[PDB]
Amino acid sequence: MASMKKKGSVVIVGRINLSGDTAYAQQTRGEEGCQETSQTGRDKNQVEGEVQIVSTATQTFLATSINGVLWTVYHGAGTRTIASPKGPVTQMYTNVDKDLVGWQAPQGSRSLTPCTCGSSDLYLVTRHADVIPVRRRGDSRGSLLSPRPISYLKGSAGGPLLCPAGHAVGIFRAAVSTRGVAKAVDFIPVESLETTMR
Amino acid sequence: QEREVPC
Ligand SMILES: [Zn+2]
Structure with missing residues (x-):
């Protein structure tokens, strides 16, 4: 003790x-x-x-x-x-x-501010300060327009996905990877944060 | 097969 x-x-x-x-x-x-x-x-x-x-x-x-x-x-x-x-x-x-x-x-x-646009063209901000386009593919999934090795996304969890107007659409949490290549991302949608707050 | 990798 x-x-x-x-x-x-x-x-x-x-x-x-x-x-x-x-x-x-x-x-x-x-x-x-x-x-x-x-x-x-x-x-x-x-x-x-x-x-x-x-x-x-x-x-x-x-x-x-x-x-x-x-x-x-x-x-x-x-x-x-x-x-x-x-x-x-x-x-x-x-x-x-x-x-x-x-x-x-x-x-x-x-x-x-949480996004109210209901738009599917998003942008992921990484720990290396890149702003990468992400097409929304579901409530918690988006696709990378250009695949990246998972190494590139490690350390970016907690960062935002933004809409074209700069509103928060979600929090990035996990790469969706095949043989070390991330073609997509898993994120926590901002609506889930909004529910948590209310 | 695709897997989730927490980042
Ligand atoms: Zn928006």
Whole structure:
């Protein structure tokens, strides 16, 4: 009992900057700082933007603010707290069945708005800051116009699928792969987030 | 066969 350890907090380590004409990844914290911040849960950095890059001790992935909640995947974050200026913040939503977790959006973040367009031409924002067209194929599936190796999509779970008007259509969670080639993606539709919130 | 790979 005396030597039992605790899991650290999820730590924001950067963002996918979508503020201008060019999408690009920015790092805001390096490895040592990330490790320290994960243990204290105290992160005094100013947060900006809609899509954060987040890390645990073992994975780096994405998290997206939609309607004042910072959302990511359960398979990345588990039940972990997130580091914040006031210390660790407990999850507000946890749903292993949807592969979905959420925390109150950090002050300074900007939130996307859920899509009401009912459109099927979508765009996936990756951890490498590419914006890839995705044709919607079902409630939770879309096809990549150009296939990619799965290596390329690893670390992008928690990132958004957007409509042409820039609304949030879903949260990316898993590649649909054959022999290492992703031709499609599985995502959590924004309507499922909306149900969770209401 | 296609499989889901969590990312
Ligand atoms: Zn829309």
